[PDB]
Amino acid sequence: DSLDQCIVNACKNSWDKSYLAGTPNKDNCSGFVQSVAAELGVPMPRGNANAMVDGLEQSWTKLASGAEAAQKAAQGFLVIAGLKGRTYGHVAVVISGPLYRQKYPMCWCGSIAGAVGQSQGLKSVGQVWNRTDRDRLNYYVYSLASCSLPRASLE
């Protein structure tokens, strides 16, 4: 029912899927983003989190802040938070919601690291990422909103 409901729905539905067959999305940050993007019909760079960040860096509009990221997600756009790693990077889906410490937007993500890198919408990016990394995040937004108009039957 909210304007961005399709984002949260795609996050929820992608959680137990395995974009990389044999590897649950909750244990695979890249696969979880791929599955969300595919449910939304949003074309997404392939490969691991690092290669995905490279692709988004080349093609997607980069947002100025985490605040701005939650604002776009609230309008029904797919918003990816990403940061390259020395060995492994990490990507998450930004969702609308109160900012953590007035700065870091709520997110969904899986992770091969386990519970520390996982969020079912209950952690912000500033809790998922290390405190040295959370101020260094890149927020990329797709060029068209994914969600549709609310139902005509709505009051």
Q: Spot the catalytic one: 6, 11, 29, 147.
A: 29
- DSSP 3-state of 92: strand
The technique by which this structure was obtained is: X-ray
What is the CATH code for 1-155? 3.90.1720.10
The beta-carbon contacts of 20-27 under 8 Å, at least 24 apart in sequence, are 24/110, 25/110, 26/110, 26/111, 26/118, 27/110, 27/111, 27/112, 27/114
Active-site option among 6, 11, 90, 147: 90
Residue type, 15: W
**Residue 91 structure tokens:** 């990507």
Contact 49, 58 (CB under 8 A): no
Q: Report d(CA 25, CA 152) in Å as an integer.
A: 34
Active site residue 109: no
Does the annotation count 90 as an active-site position? yes
Q: How do the domains of the chain map onto residue ranges?
A: 1-155
- The resolution, in Å, is 2.1
Cα gap 139→62, rounded to integer Å: 6
Separate counts of helices (H) and strands (E) for the chain: 5, 6
